[PDB]
Amino acid sequence: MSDINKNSELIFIPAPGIGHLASALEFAKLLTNHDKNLYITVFCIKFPGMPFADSYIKSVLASQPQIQLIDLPEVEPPPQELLKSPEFYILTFLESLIPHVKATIKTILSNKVVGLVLDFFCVSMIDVGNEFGIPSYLFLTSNVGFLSLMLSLKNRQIEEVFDDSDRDHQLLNIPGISNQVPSNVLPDACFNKDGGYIAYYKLAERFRDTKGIIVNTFSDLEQSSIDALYDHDEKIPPIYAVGPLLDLKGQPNPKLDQAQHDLILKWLDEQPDKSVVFLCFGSMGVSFGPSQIREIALGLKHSGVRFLWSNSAEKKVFPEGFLEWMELEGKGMICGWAPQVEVLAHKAIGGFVSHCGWNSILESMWFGVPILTWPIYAEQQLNAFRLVKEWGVGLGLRVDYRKGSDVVAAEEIEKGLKDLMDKDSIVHKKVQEMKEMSRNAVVDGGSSLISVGKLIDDITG
Amino acid sequence: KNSELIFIPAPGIGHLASALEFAKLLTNHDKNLYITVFCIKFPGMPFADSYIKSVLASQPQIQLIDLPEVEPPPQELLKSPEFYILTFLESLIPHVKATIKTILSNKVVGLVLDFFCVSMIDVGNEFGIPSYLFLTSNVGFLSLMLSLKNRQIEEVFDDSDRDHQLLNIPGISNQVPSNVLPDACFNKDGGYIAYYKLAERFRDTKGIIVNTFSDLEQSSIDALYDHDEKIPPIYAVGPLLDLKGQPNPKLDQAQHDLILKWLDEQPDKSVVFLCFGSMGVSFGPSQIREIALGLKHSGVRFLWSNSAEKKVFPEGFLEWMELEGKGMICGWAPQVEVLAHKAIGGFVSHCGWNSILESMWFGVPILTWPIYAEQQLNAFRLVKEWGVGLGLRVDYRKGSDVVAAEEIEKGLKDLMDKDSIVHKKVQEMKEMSRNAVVDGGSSLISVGKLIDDITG
Ligand SMILES: O=c1ccn([C@@H]2O[C@H](COP(=O)(O)OP(=O)(O)O)[C@@H](O)[C@H]2O)c(=O)[nH]1
Ligand SMILES: O=c1ccn([C@@H]2O[C@H](COP(=O)(O)OP(=O)(O)O)[C@@H](O)[C@H]2O)c(=O)[nH]1
Known part of the structure; x- marks a missing residue:
């Protein structure tokens, strides 16, 4: 009874390519290393004309009894013309996989599944999780700085793209970031009127629907930013700093x-x-x-x-x-x-x-x-x-x-x-x-391990 | 039957040269025509009278007069070369006026002003002297300048919002891409203002002389007349060239x-x-x-x-x-x-x-x-x-x-x-x-008509 009671499962849906995959796999390993009864299923998406497939992932995992991977069927890629905005292209490709994600979840569903862990670009999958009564966690491969920028988009409309005019001199006050941010250091997407801003907007919009936001960063680096965010809007779910999450060996290319x-x-x-x-x-x-x-x-x-x-x-x-x-x-x-x-x-x-x-x-x-x-x-x-x-x-x-x-x-x-x-x-x-x-941050008793422990408790409780 | 013309080219040997070739062309075609060229030294640079006598060839009908130098405008204005030059020349009005009064006689028949010196038309007006515009550029530039009147004084061309914006300018057949306009047209630091201020006086001159030839831009000239009757006669007297090149x-x-x-x-x-x-x-x-x-x-x-x-x-x-x-x-x-x-x-x-x-x-x-x-x-x-x-x-x-x-x-x-x-x-x-420049050629015919208009 106790064993059955302790078993839990998470479904990971990371974004394609190293840069998004590396930290997500290292995260799956960190989680399993800190709870012997925690199992993880990683959905492996095939990006149009791109490497870092099964070979890479298995290489990174290097044998893990608590982690298995399942490939999602290949789907028609969105039109190349949409590349006028990489971000919108990515968002479109991912939402096109919703049917297959739902179908795959239905196939491996059980009552021990306690949540989805989604990449920034896969937050549309939250609705699929809700269909099965499964809550979603956002796993951010970037930092709290980027999170602060995304959370600030709520105060604006989807039609008000950032001004590509005089960004050479336009200081912005973004809660979470202590310094006034020059407009000229904002991501291309913020100024993209061809889907870029729309994509960022649509994704950020789902951030607050997650049960928690896990970030690849550490307290000694961005605690003041995390604190600043809470002091600004308590509506933000709990933020967990569990990094640095790195692949210190590197995999064959x-x-x-x-x-x-x-x-x-x-x-x-x-x-x-x-x-x-x-x-x-x-x-x-x-x-x-x-x-x-x-x-x-x-x-x-x-x-x-x-x-x-x-x-x-x-x-x-x-x-x-x-x-x-x-x-x-x-x-x-x-x-x-x-x-x-x-x-x-x-x-x-x-x-x-x-x-x-x-x-x-x-x-x-x-x-x-x-x-x-x-x-x-x-x-x-x-x-x-x-x-x-x-x-x-x-x-x-x-x-x-x-x-x-x-x-x-x-x-x-x-x-x-x-x-x-x-x-x-x-x-x-x-x-x-x-x-x-x-x-x-990552040694026993360090900020990130204390954080991962509490995160696992929150996930499986 | 002597006639006297006062030439006021823009500062610098580049302009002093073009003006001298033109002075030579006119005096060569009227033995009784004398020209006095006012020399203005550009802020700083020497070029005093080295190139002057150099290409002088001791022309009896051409005389050079150096105007005293004056404090140049503040360096801050260099954000716009055009506005800087305009400001400089305007500060020379008192000296220009005084020099004209000193050599004034019943024989002075007109002032020939470079593009950047056209605001001096007011000085000529004071003495009852007609002013002619002398463009070292072409009729295309003339067309652009004349079209500025269809805008305001603060309308610095849609704020450099140029990428695909096409413009229809009388005098130029092809629709003109906004991205091939002069920097001054987009300069909000005085460039557009300078161009606007000068162009605004083009139609007030007695005639517009251009360093170009009929076989090259006659159709542009015709389009201009057909578009605005207020435009004075345009004389194509080029190519004006110094075939010896700056010796010094x-x-x-x-x-x-x-x-x-x-x-x-x-x-x-x-x-x-x-x-x-x-x-x-x-x-x-x-x-x-x-x-x-x-x-x-x-x-x-x-x-x-x-x-x-x-x-x-x-x-x-x-x-x-x-x-x-x-x-x-x-x-x-x-x-x-x-x-x-x-x-x-x-x-x-x-x-x-x-x-x-x-x-x-x-x-x-x-x-x-x-x-x-x-x-x-x-x-x-x-x-x-x-x-x-x-x-x-x-x-x-x-x-x-x-x-x-x-x-x-x-x-x-x-x-x-x-x-x-x-x-x-x-x-x-x-x-x-x-x-264009041999006897019977378009520019020499134009020269004769211009001299007749000047001394007539
Ligand atoms: O020649 C290379 C280039 C990149 N990387 C790794 O690929 C990842 C790059 O991720 P990052 O977020 O820094 O940049 P991205 O490629 O996602 O724009 C890091 O783990 C790098 O160590 C590598 O091993 N060799
Ligand atoms: O190294 C050079 C550069 C230019 N010139 C002459 O300088 C004048 C340049 O006039 P242009 O209107 O072509 O250009 P600007 O210097 O006025 O921008 C022409 O007579 C050129 O032949 C020259 O003799 N040697």
Whole structure:
């Protein structure tokens, strides 16, 4: 009787791709590690023309008796024309899977199922859960900063898209974020009149219908933001900080063979401690244009810093002689896909030019690597802004860069690199302190484990 | 039977030169016509009287008078070049008025004012002297200016809300894209106001003289008359060109000769000349690197005039030029002598009007890269109206993002493609250019009519 009574089940419905999947799987593992009678079923969605399928997930899970996965049938992808807004495209694709989600839940339903854990983009699934009397929990792969922005959309109408006019000078007061936020660091979606704003609006609208909001962040980083949100609107469900949630091993990717993988780390072994700058801009596989790539190459070479540069640019694009020089001196290396967590863990890495995706930020924080910000899409500009202006752990190259921005010149890049690699940088002390705080969050008795315990109690009670 | 005209060109040798060629043209056609040119020194820059006597050729019928210099306007106004210049010239009214009164006689028959000096028409009015507008630009620019009257004084063109907005301007056949309008039209810091204030006086002049020719824009002139009877007579007296080029800085021609010798060594019509005006502001480092790569990869031979520091160029670029000799870079260039050179087969130009006229005169095709003033408009018409040029960009302006090497290379190859459609129109435009200024040609007939109107 006691055993039956203790068994509980959660159904996870994460968004496609690493960046959304990694933390969600690590979360499923954290949960099961803290309740032997907690079982989880992960619905695996197939995104049109995209990797990170079963292979990746099973690799991450690496055997877990309390976690099983079920693939959802493939459905017709939405029209490409809707890509005028990635966010709206994603929302449309996910809502198209509602019928299959309902059908799959009906097939594995039992009376021990106590809830759904949904990604930000899958909140429409809340209604499906209600059909079965199953409550839903929001699992946010971003931070409390992004949550604050989404929760603020309630005070406005779905037709009032953010002004794309003078965002070069428009400070906004967003409850949750202490600093006035420059309008030019808001996500592209907020200004998108072709579905972007509508998508953000429609999703944020469902946030308050969840039984709880779980965030991949930690108390020492955003407790004041969480407190600020409550002090503003008590209608917000309970917020649980259970991070950092990271995949510290990394999983195999086709764009990186074992030989390539091994050589990168061995090359790093040969470099002086904290002398190498790592450059990586996410998992989307879309590089900067030719001119911009040339400017980065020249800036890197002119700075004299050693580097590991991950990019998918064609060889013909590089400045004449650059690649020859690079492999002649061996002062730098280029790869198509990097074993990021192993790189950030290496003693040779002294800096990280990042696109500021949240997982990449958490990883750099966990390893105490300083970041030179170069945001591009999603909420990366907001993350860059806070890293530089709020937490003071990063240096700004650009905090408002986005698709359509002008090319960043080699001279400006060279300047950022020198400041980043400066041993006497002021952010150095802050980064060291942030490393300690992120590590302590997840040890026994740390803020995140105390939080996960209470979350599990709330879920299964 | 002497008559005297007072010329007041805009500050700077660029304008002093254009005004002098015009003074020469008029005096050459009326032995009893004398011209007095008021020289105004641009805030700061020297150019005192070096180029003056340089191209003077001791013309008995032409005299130069230097007006005292005055405190230039505050640097803060530089947010709008046009408004800055306008303010400067207006502060010169007292001196202009005093100088006219000192040389006034029953023989003075009129004032010839540059575009930026048209507000001086009030000074001429005080002495009962008629004012003529002298445009160093073309009838397309005249058309745009005259159309400003259909707007308000604070209507700075929909607040740069230009992207697809098309405009119908009398005098210009094609609907004009809002993105090829001069920076001043969108400038809310005084640019639009300056243009509006000057244009507002165009119809008050006794006649409008333009550096252009009938075979090029007669239809635009006809459209204008047909659209507004208040427009005074328009006289096309160009091309007005200095076929000798600014001699000074004259120091026996060290760098000069270096340039011409290099060109003498290249195959005929194999060289692309790149030159972007006389204002001196160089494209930024990134853009300079993209032009360098584009040129090298394209395979064309080239003579590139620029003011970039040597350290900015792509690594290996400078060495390559010196070793393979396919191209070379220089600073200030003897542009007319270069365009006249048989080695030149193409010209990447900022599309300033004098550069356009000089290129048409020597039959050299242009690949357009406008930057400021009415250059985008000039570029637009060169490509879409006259077909004598190829467009790299027609809407480029300060603030535009870098034009990549790939795009430049494509432009260079099309420009140097002997089967391009521009080459045929170019030869014809060359003939029409030359024919405009010979006896019986349209511009000399116009000159006679103008002198008759002036001294009549
Ligand atoms: O070349 C790469 C690029 C990215 N990543 C990993 O992919 C995830 C990227 O997530 P993030 O939110 O930082 O950016 P996103 O790709 O979602 O825009 C992180 O775990 C990175 O460590 C990696 O391992 N190698
Ligand atoms: O390096 C140079 C650049 C320009 N010019 C001359 O300077 C004048 C430029 O006039 P334009 O209206 O074409 O451009 P602007 O300099 O007024 O913007 C023309 O006579 C060009 O031939 C020259 O001789 N050498």
